[PDB]
Design an enzyme around this catalytic site. Structure first.
Site, short mmCIF file in Angstrom:
data_model
loop_
_atom_site.label_atom_id
_atom_site.label_comp_id
_atom_site.label_asym_id
_atom_site.label_seq_id
_atom_site.Cartn_x
_atom_site.Cartn_y
_atom_site.Cartn_z
N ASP A 1 -24.39 -34.74 58.21
CA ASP A 1 -24.74 -35.37 56.95
C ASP A 1 -23.51 -36.03 56.34
N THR B 1 -30.49 -38.96 52.59
CA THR B 1 -30.68 -38.01 53.68
C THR B 1 -32.07 -37.95 54.29
N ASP C 1 -26.42 -39.45 59.39
CA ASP C 1 -27.56 -40.08 58.70
C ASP C 1 -27.13 -41.26 57.78
N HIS D 1 -23.92 -41.90 47.84
CA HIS D 1 -24.48 -42.77 48.86
C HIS D 1 -25.89 -43.13 48.45
N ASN E 1 -48.77 -59.94 51.34
CA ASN E 1 -48.97 -58.51 51.10
C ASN E 1 -47.70 -57.70 51.40
N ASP F 1 -45.92 -56.78 53.97
CA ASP F 1 -45.94 -55.73 54.99
C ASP F 1 -44.97 -56.04 56.14
N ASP G 1 -48.99 -63.14 57.75
CA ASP G 1 -50.31 -63.20 57.11
C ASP G 1 -51.29 -64.01 57.94
C1 LIG Z 1 -43.34 -50.45 61.89
O1 LIG Z 1 -44.10 -49.71 62.84
C2 LIG Z 1 -45.31 -49.15 62.38
C3 LIG Z 1 -45.95 -48.25 63.48
O2 LIG Z 1 -46.39 -49.07 64.57
C4 LIG Z 1 -46.21 -50.30 61.95
O3 LIG Z 1 -47.20 -49.72 61.15
C5 LIG Z 1 -48.52 -49.81 61.70
O4 LIG Z 1 -49.11 -51.05 61.37
C6 LIG Z 1 -50.47 -51.24 61.72
C7 LIG Z 1 -50.92 -52.58 61.15
O5 LIG Z 1 -50.70 -52.61 59.74
C8 LIG Z 1 -51.38 -50.09 61.21
O6 LIG Z 1 -52.66 -50.23 61.81
C9 LIG Z 1 -53.72 -49.88 60.88
O7 LIG Z 1 -54.11 -48.53 61.05
C10 LIG Z 1 -55.06 -48.05 60.13
C11 LIG Z 1 -55.25 -46.55 60.37
O8 LIG Z 1 -54.00 -45.95 60.10
C12 LIG Z 1 -54.07 -44.51 60.07
O9 LIG Z 1 -53.90 -43.90 61.34
C13 LIG Z 1 -52.62 -44.07 61.94
C14 LIG Z 1 -52.62 -43.48 63.36
O10 LIG Z 1 -52.72 -42.07 63.37
C15 LIG Z 1 -51.51 -43.52 61.02
O11 LIG Z 1 -50.23 -43.79 61.55
C16 LIG Z 1 -51.61 -44.10 59.61
O12 LIG Z 1 -50.65 -43.48 58.77
C17 LIG Z 1 -50.33 -44.28 57.60
O13 LIG Z 1 -51.03 -43.90 56.42
C18 LIG Z 1 -50.83 -42.56 55.98
C19 LIG Z 1 -51.34 -42.47 54.55
O14 LIG Z 1 -52.73 -42.73 54.58
C20 LIG Z 1 -49.36 -42.07 56.00
O15 LIG Z 1 -49.32 -40.68 56.28
C21 LIG Z 1 -48.43 -42.78 56.99
O16 LIG Z 1 -47.12 -42.69 56.46
C22 LIG Z 1 -48.84 -44.23 57.25
O17 LIG Z 1 -48.60 -44.99 56.07
C23 LIG Z 1 -48.16 -46.35 56.30
O18 LIG Z 1 -49.16 -47.22 56.85
C24 LIG Z 1 -50.23 -47.63 56.01
C25 LIG Z 1 -51.19 -48.54 56.78
O19 LIG Z 1 -51.90 -47.76 57.72
C26 LIG Z 1 -49.67 -48.30 54.74
O20 LIG Z 1 -50.70 -48.68 53.86
C27 LIG Z 1 -48.69 -47.36 54.04
O21 LIG Z 1 -48.07 -48.02 52.98
C28 LIG Z 1 -47.59 -46.88 54.97
O22 LIG Z 1 -46.71 -47.97 55.17
C29 LIG Z 1 -53.05 -43.95 59.08
O23 LIG Z 1 -53.32 -42.59 58.83
C30 LIG Z 1 -56.37 -48.85 60.25
O24 LIG Z 1 -57.25 -48.42 59.24
C31 LIG Z 1 -56.12 -50.36 60.14
O25 LIG Z 1 -57.33 -51.06 60.45
C32 LIG Z 1 -57.78 -52.01 59.43
O26 LIG Z 1 -57.29 -53.34 59.65
C33 LIG Z 1 -57.70 -53.82 60.93
C34 LIG Z 1 -56.90 -55.04 61.39
O27 LIG Z 1 -56.97 -55.08 62.80
C35 LIG Z 1 -59.23 -54.05 60.96
O28 LIG Z 1 -59.66 -54.43 62.25
C36 LIG Z 1 -59.96 -52.76 60.56
O29 LIG Z 1 -61.31 -53.10 60.32
C37 LIG Z 1 -59.32 -52.07 59.34
O30 LIG Z 1 -59.75 -52.77 58.18
C38 LIG Z 1 -60.43 -51.90 57.25
O31 LIG Z 1 -59.56 -51.43 56.22
C39 LIG Z 1 -58.97 -52.47 55.45
C40 LIG Z 1 -57.87 -51.90 54.57
O32 LIG Z 1 -58.33 -50.71 53.96
C41 LIG Z 1 -60.06 -53.21 54.67
O33 LIG Z 1 -59.52 -54.31 53.97
C42 LIG Z 1 -61.17 -53.70 55.62
O34 LIG Z 1 -62.23 -54.24 54.86
C43 LIG Z 1 -61.63 -52.62 56.61
O35 LIG Z 1 -62.44 -51.64 55.98
C44 LIG Z 1 -54.93 -50.82 61.02
O36 LIG Z 1 -55.27 -50.91 62.39
C45 LIG Z 1 -50.76 -48.72 61.50
O37 LIG Z 1 -51.45 -47.68 60.83
C46 LIG Z 1 -49.30 -48.67 61.05
N1 LIG Z 1 -48.72 -47.38 61.40
C47 LIG Z 1 -47.84 -46.70 60.65
C48 LIG Z 1 -47.37 -45.39 61.20
O38 LIG Z 1 -47.42 -47.09 59.57
C49 LIG Z 1 -45.47 -51.33 61.08
O39 LIG Z 1 -46.26 -52.47 60.95
C50 LIG Z 1 -44.10 -51.74 61.60
N2 LIG Z 1 -43.38 -52.58 60.64
C51 LIG Z 1 -42.88 -53.79 60.91
C52 LIG Z 1 -42.14 -54.54 59.83
O40 LIG Z 1 -42.99 -54.32 62.02
O1 YOC Z 2 -32.23 -29.00 60.02
C1 YOC Z 2 -32.31 -29.99 59.30
O2 YOC Z 2 -32.24 -31.29 59.86
C2 YOC Z 2 -33.47 -31.87 60.39
C3 YOC Z 2 -33.22 -33.00 61.42
C4 YOC Z 2 -32.17 -33.05 62.34
C5 YOC Z 2 -32.07 -34.08 63.29
C6 YOC Z 2 -33.02 -35.09 63.33
C7 YOC Z 2 -32.97 -36.19 64.41
F1 YOC Z 2 -31.87 -36.96 64.35
F2 YOC Z 2 -32.98 -35.75 65.67
F3 YOC Z 2 -34.01 -37.03 64.39
C8 YOC Z 2 -34.08 -35.09 62.41
C9 YOC Z 2 -34.17 -34.05 61.47
F4 YOC Z 2 -35.19 -34.07 60.62
N1 YOC Z 2 -32.44 -29.92 57.88
C10 YOC Z 2 -31.76 -28.83 57.14
C11 YOC Z 2 -32.30 -28.68 55.71
C12 YOC Z 2 -32.29 -30.01 54.98
C13 YOC Z 2 -33.04 -31.06 55.78
C14 YOC Z 2 -32.41 -31.20 57.16
C15 YOC Z 2 -32.78 -29.97 53.49
N2 YOC Z 2 -31.46 -30.54 53.12
C16 YOC Z 2 -30.93 -31.00 51.90
O3 YOC Z 2 -31.62 -30.97 50.89
C17 YOC Z 2 -29.50 -31.53 51.90
C18 YOC Z 2 -29.48 -33.04 51.54
C19 YOC Z 2 -28.05 -33.65 51.59
C20 YOC Z 2 -27.04 -32.59 51.32
N3 YOC Z 2 -25.65 -32.64 51.34
N4 YOC Z 2 -25.13 -31.41 51.00
N5 YOC Z 2 -26.11 -30.58 50.76
C21 YOC Z 2 -27.33 -31.27 50.95
C22 YOC Z 2 -28.70 -30.74 50.84
C23 YOC Z 2 -30.87 -30.46 54.49
CA CA Z 3 -27.42 -37.10 54.05
#
Ligand SMILES: *[C@@H]1O[C@H](CO)[C@@H](O[C@@H]2O[C@H](CO)[C@@H](O[C@@H]3O[C@H](CO[C@H]4O[C@H](CO)[C@@H](O)[C@H](O[C@H]5O[C@H](CO)[C@@H](O)[C@H](O)[C@@H]5O[C@H]5O[C@H](CO)[C@@H](O)[C@H](O)[C@@H]5O)[C@@H]4O)[C@@H](O)[C@H](O[C@H]4O[C@H](CO)[C@@H](O)[C@H](O)[C@@H]4O[C@H]4O[C@H](CO)[C@@H](O)[C@H](O)[C@@H]4O)[C@@H]3O)[C@H](O)[C@H]2NC(C)=O)[C@H](O)[C@H]1NC(C)=O
Ligand code: YOC
Ligand code: CA
Ligand code: CA
Ligand code: CL
Ligand code: K
Ligand code: NA
Ligand code: ZN
Length: 806
Positions: free
Chosen positions: A121, A159, A308, A420, A685, A687, A691
């Site tokens: 860290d 972190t 990190d 940081h 949007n 993203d 678009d």
């Molecule tokens: C960086 O890399 C990542 C990973 O590859 C890229 O992100 C991917 O982009 C894809 C395109 O945007 C996206 O695909 C969509 O998936 C939807 C289902 O997603 C769920 O399942 C996956 C798989 O398990 C999971 O990863 C997702 O997790 C997200 O959401 C949860 C919260 O709900 C979070 O826990 C998680 O952090 C993550 O959040 C992030 O992503 C979402 C978008 O999914 C953002 O909104 C968040 O802000 C956050 O950034 C999900 O659990 C699926 O539903 C989509 O399908 C719709 O669109 C298609 C287009 O082909 C269409 O055909 C379908 O009909 C559908 O449309 C319907 O829904 C619309 C919107 O509601 C609606 O308008 C319509 O009318 C329809 O009803 C789509 O396929 C993929 O999920 C993400 N993956 C991740 C991990 O983020 C990313 O793009 C890269 N970045 C760059 C700059 O390159």
């Molecule tokens: O075990 C661990 O690390 C996980 C890990 C390790 C490696 C890779 C990966 F690189 F492989 F991906 C991914 C990955 F999630 N954790 C130990 C517990 C904390 C999270 C991390 C909670 N925490 C803190 O709150 C510290 C923040 C900043 C700091 N400065 N001084 N005091 C602090 C406190 C440290």
């Molecule tokens: Ca850190």
């Protein structure tokens, strides 16, 4: 509730977690107040310390000891790490010469070389050089293994966002951990460093390395360590796990150190108190490598030593207070510190107005040490917008500074000298990477890279298929002695049309005029060749970009430039041209100031029109190939074709004009020619992804001419600047940008001055990777070079940062 009445007898640091209310013995039970009554006694032995002394050799096994010096310890896998050195005449790993590890040298039963991630860290990149005298073990890893001069963290350089990016290969906006503190309005819930809400699975998106591993049959050590478990016990637990039977033994392990971040906050990055934490981390690396060598695993395991983020000099008196800017300071909530994020304190207040808040924060003091942004206007390279947890209003804080809400927050919440979280291009935020092992190269320096790329490589190192992520798989192949992955170029989805002259001037009714009615088989055969692509090898140096989605577009050739013209968006997707070192800048002749000419290759129906620009009082227009750089008076007419035209706010034309008239020539001059590809980006949007037509929120009034959110350029030349850009026999050099297409220059506080005082700094702020532009345009660049594809992938992920040397 947990019935903490079971036992840890023989379960110390068990690899499977049991479900409450049974009591736990794993390395995370402490953090869940759920350990068995005897966990400390059995699992956290400390008696006698951590090292074998001469009089402990051959001893009788006393199970109360933290580690053992007895004869059976090697079989039981539980010697102190220095056992063989003290008792069996061996040397420490750091004293051995390094010898290339051509192949894994593992004990029988090891199916794959284990991976160990040693994460630190706040380990600032310059510590490698500046603390080198006190880190012999780390310096051996670095110089014998593969190392980068630095590794770029993700924004914010905090972190959790960074550890979870390392684990997932995703931007914080995609993985969901967008800061050390967050609010989620759909959950209506909050996330903090201290507390239990952070333990809820719903915060954590994506798929981290340990889950990728598990689902694919590769067993994982448990990455997280309770704060009370001391480093030495973490090392011995890892080493014990490595002695387990084949069917039970994990292949991937993590060690984490809270140092040197912890001391760096107190003492600053180079405080004299910082030498000691660095000695201590090194000592721990020593214990691991000694322990691996004892187990005959030191030429078998791949070790990653990774930070990190770095650390910067920051004090209490370098705090800007929103209360010196805002009248309504109590109607807002601020996430404070090395970055700012603002929202309304109450959802039920309709007198809250983001726009007036931004205005009160914009260029209000001469030396102002933060800049407000709407999140979608942040530099695209930060990829910091597409998450409901990221507040609409953001403040980018100058390095060395803090932002707080009111002075009471700072003296009633100087304590610290280090912090940081700043922009991830900042030097002091850069961190480290070293890979050492059979799978990494021997004595190899690689160029700096981004931490989003490592998930892929750690997947490769373990024979895993990575989940979809933001890395570019293959861009780090040059770190590896043997590669599991060899990427192919994506298939082109749409093939272009090659239109000829199909329309007469009189078919066009665009409201455009040009004083071009000034009139020879010498210069008419010539110009036909140019329109068929005779100069195409000059202006298109790496082949045409491939279009990776379904659309309708035309290739258009000209003496000075080639374009891929979209019949759907009514403008080029890309415009490609080469400006040699010797090339000359001219001005737009007076008679051709307002000139726009119909393109007889492209139908009226798939063209822009000048009338819409006339009627639209906000929107003007510019050109993708600049008229200023025409190769001849006659070629200049080509630059005024309606198909070279794009919409531009007057405020933005100030930036664009300066870039085209002055900077392109400067770059050609400094780099010995440049190839330029410029074009529009639409990301309404925010993203980071191209678009579709139905996502466009703004048109030139009364038309179907859509307004870009951004303009890009990719500027390529020869890495060997002794060779001209158009005749380069080797590696390329690139810089790119994605400029926000904004109706004002509020972003630049000096924009009332001459372009020469502010434009280039703006362009620098919006520097970009070619790869960022790919995502945003659906295009694939560098299709035809003489370079290997892996080298091109490295090139595409390059970012020109404009920081001085580290
Ligand atoms: C960086 O890399 C990542 C990973 O590859 C890229 O992100 C991917 O982009 C894809 C395109 O945007 C996206 O695909 C969509 O998936 C939807 C289902 O997603 C769920 O399942 C996956 C798989 O398990 C999971 O990863 C997702 O997790 C997200 O959401 C949860 C919260 O709900 C979070 O826990 C998680 O952090 C993550 O959040 C992030 O992503 C979402 C978008 O999914 C953002 O909104 C968040 O802000 C956050 O950034 C999900 O659990 C699926 O539903 C989509 O399908 C719709 O669109 C298609 C287009 O082909 C269409 O055909 C379908 O009909 C559908 O449309 C319907 O829904 C619309 C919107 O509601 C609606 O308008 C319509 O009318 C329809 O009803 C789509 O396929 C993929 O999920 C993400 N993956 C991740 C991990 O983020 C990313 O793009 C890269 N970045 C760059 C700059 O390159
Ligand atoms: O075990 C661990 O690390 C996980 C890990 C390790 C490696 C890779 C990966 F690189 F492989 F991906 C991914 C990955 F999630 N954790 C130990 C517990 C904390 C999270 C991390 C909670 N925490 C803190 O709150 C510290 C923040 C900043 C700091 N400065 N001084 N005091 C602090 C406190 C440290
Ligand atoms: Ca850190
Ligand atoms: Ca988009
Ligand atoms: Cl934060
Ligand atoms: K106009
Ligand atoms: Na301004
Ligand atoms: Zn910290």
């Amino acid at each position: 509730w947990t019935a903490t009445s079971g036992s840890c007898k023989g379960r110390c640091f068990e690899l499977q977690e049991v479900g409450p209310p049974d009591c736990r013995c794993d390395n995370l039970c402490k953090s869940y107040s759920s350990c068995c009554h005897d966990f400390d006694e059995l699992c956290l032995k400390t008696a006698r310390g951590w090292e074998c002394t001469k009089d402990r050799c051959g001893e009788v096994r006393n199970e109360e000891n933290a580690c053992h010096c007895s004869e059976d310890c090697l079989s039981r896998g539980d010697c102190c790490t220095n056992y063989q050195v003290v008792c069996k005449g061996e040397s420490h790993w750091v004293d051995d010469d390094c010898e290339e590890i051509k192949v894994p040298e593992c004990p029988a039963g090891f199916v794959r070389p284990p991976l160990i991630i040693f994460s630190v860290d706040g380990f600032r990149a310059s510590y490698m050089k500046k603390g080198s005298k006190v880190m012999p073990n780390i310096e051996k890893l670095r110089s014998c293994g593969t190392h980068a001069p630095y590794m770029r963290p993700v924004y914010p350089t905090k972190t959790f966002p960074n550890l979870y990016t390392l684990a997932t290969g995703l931007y914080p906006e995609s993985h969901g951990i967008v800061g050390n503190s967050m609010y989620d309005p759909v959950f209506d819930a909050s996330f903090h460093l201290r507390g239990r809400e952070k333990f809820n699975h719903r915060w954590w998106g994506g798929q981290p390395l340990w889950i990728t591993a598990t689902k694919q049959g590769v067993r994982a050590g448990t990455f997280f360590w309770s704060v009370s478990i001391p480093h030495e016990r973490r090392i011995l637990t890892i080493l014990q796990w490595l002695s387990l039977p084949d069917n039970e033994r994990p292949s991937v392990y993590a060690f984490y150190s809270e140092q040197p971040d912890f001391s760096g906050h107190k003492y600053g990055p180079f405080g004299p108190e910082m030498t000691n934490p660095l000695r201590e981390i090194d000592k721990t690396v020593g214990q691991l490598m000694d322990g691996l060598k004892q187990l005959r695993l030191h030429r078998c395991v791949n070790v990653i030593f990774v930070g990190d983020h770095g650390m910067e000099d920051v004090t209490c008196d370098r705090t800007e207070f929103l209360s010196n800017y805002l009248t309504n300071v109590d109607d807002i909530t601020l996430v404070p510190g090395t970055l700012g994020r603002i929202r309304a304190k109450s959802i039920n207040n309709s007198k809250y107005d983001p726009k007036t808040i931004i205005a009160a924060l914009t260029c209000k003091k001469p030396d102002q040490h933060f800049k407000p942004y709407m999140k979608q206007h942040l530099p695209k390279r930060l990829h910091y917008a597409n998450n409901r947890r990221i507040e609409d209003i953001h403040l980018l804080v100058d390095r060395r500074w803090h932002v707080a809400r009111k002075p009471l927050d700072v003296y009633k919440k100087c304590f610290f000298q280090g912090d940081h979280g700043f922009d991830n291009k900042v030097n002091s935020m850069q961190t480290v990477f070293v890979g050492y092992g059979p799978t990494f190269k021997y004595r190899t320096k690689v160029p700096p890279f981004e931490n989003i790329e490592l998930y892929n490589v750690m997947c490769d190192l373990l024979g895993l298929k990575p989940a979809p992520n933001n890395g570019t798989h293959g861009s780090l192949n040059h770190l590896l002695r043997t590669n599991t992955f060899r990427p192919t170029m994506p298939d082109e989805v749409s093939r272009p049309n090659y239109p000829g002259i199909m329309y007469l001037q009189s078919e066009f009714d665009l409201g455009c005029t040009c004083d071009d009615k000034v009139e020879n088989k010498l210069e008419e055969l010539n110009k036909r060749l140019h329109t068929k692509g005779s100069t195409k090898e000059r202006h298109l140096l790496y082949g045409r970009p491939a279009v990776l989605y379904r659309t309708s577009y035309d290739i258009l050739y000209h003496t000075d430039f080639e374009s891929g013209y979209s019949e759907i968006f009514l403008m080029p997707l890309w415009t490609s041209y080469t400006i040699s070192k010797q090339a000359e800048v001219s001005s737009i002749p007076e008679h051709l100031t307002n000139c726009v000419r119909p393109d007889v290759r492209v139908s009226p129906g798939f063209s822009q029109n000048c009338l819409a620009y006339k009627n639209d009082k906000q929107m003007s227009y510019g050109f993708l190939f600049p008229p200023y750089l025409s190769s001849s008076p006659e070629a200049k007419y080509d630059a005024f074709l309606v198909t070279n035209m794009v919409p531009m706010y007057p405020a933005f034309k100030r930036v664009w004009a300066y870039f085209q008239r002055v900077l392109v020539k400067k770059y050609a001059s400094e780099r010995n020619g440049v190839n330029v590809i410029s074009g529009p980006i639409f990301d309404y949007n925010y993203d980071g992804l191209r678009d579709t037509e139905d996502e466009i929120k703004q048109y030139v009034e009364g038309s179907s001419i859509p307004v870009p959110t951004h303009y890009y350029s990719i500027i390529t030349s020869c890495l060997d600047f002794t060779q001209p850009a158009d005749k380069c026999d080797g590696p390329l050099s690139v810089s790119s940008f994605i400029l926000p297409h904004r109706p004002d220059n509020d972003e630049s506080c000096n924009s009332s001055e001459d372009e020469s005082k502010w434009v280039e700094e703006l362009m620098k702020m919006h520097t970009a990777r070619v790869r960022d532009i790919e995502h945003l345009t659906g295009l694939d660049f560098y299709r035809k070079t003489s370079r290997s594809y892996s080298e091109i992938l490295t090139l595409k992920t390059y970012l020109h940062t404009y920081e001085s040397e580290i």
